[PDB]
């Protein structure tokens, strides 16, 4: 419904990651993706793990660092009309439990997929490129800056 009916906060999008059971749901979604990837018959284990890493990282990048704004009308007159979700999170507070969790989890996934890929160099470079693509925007310095003016408006 309309924003402000049961809560005075102008931008609810900044609290969705601080809710109850959201972290458990995130981990369960990763696990379900891994299971449905293992379900494929003709794909080997290291390929499955690198696909898990790549798909999770791509989806995370798309949702956190690509889509900007809010999916609903907001009564602060579009203050966050250009900010992405990672920038909207917690009203710009750079370190928080949710931000720490979201930054840590791809690194743990990278460690697991490096162990299960037997440290192959091709998988190493693929997973490292993906991990950098996810971890670079999380830097506090890289806040509100668009390289070469891409996705600015």
């Amino acid at each position: 419904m309309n924003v402000g009916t049961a809560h005075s906060e102008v931008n609810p999008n900044t609290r969705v990651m601080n809710s109850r059971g959201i972290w458990l749901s995130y981990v369960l979604a990763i696990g379900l993706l891994h299971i449905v990837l293992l379900s494929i018959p003709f794909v080997s284990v290291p390929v499955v793990w690198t696909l898990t890493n790549l798909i999770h990282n791509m989806g995370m990048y798309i949702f956190l660092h690509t889509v900007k704004g809010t999916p609903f009308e907001t009564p602060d007159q579009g203050k966050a009309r250009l900010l992405t979700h990672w920038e909207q999170m917690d009203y710009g507070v750079q370190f928080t439990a949710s931000r720490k969790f979201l930054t840590i989890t791809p690194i743990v996934l990278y460690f697991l997929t490096s162990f299960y890929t037997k440290y192959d160099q091709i998988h190493f470079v693929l997973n490292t490129v993906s991990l950098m693509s996810v971890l670079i925007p999380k830097l506090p310095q890289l806040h509100g800056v668009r390289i070469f003016g891409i996705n600015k408006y």
């Binding site: 299971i35 449905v36 379900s39 494929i40 018959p41």
Partner: protein, 62 residues
Amino acid sequence: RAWKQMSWFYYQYLLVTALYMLEPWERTVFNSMLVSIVGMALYTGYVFMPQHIMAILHYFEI
């Protein structure tokens, strides 16, 4: 009796998965994808994993 119970369980499935508010073709798409994934998983589990769970199911049936 049992048909009513199964219809109730399907209703609960619709409520939980939010399929209740979708249109029929969206329900068809979601159900087809779900059954395809379950069938593929069963095929993989039978082909590769040993039938130890099948032995447990047979023991439970007996």
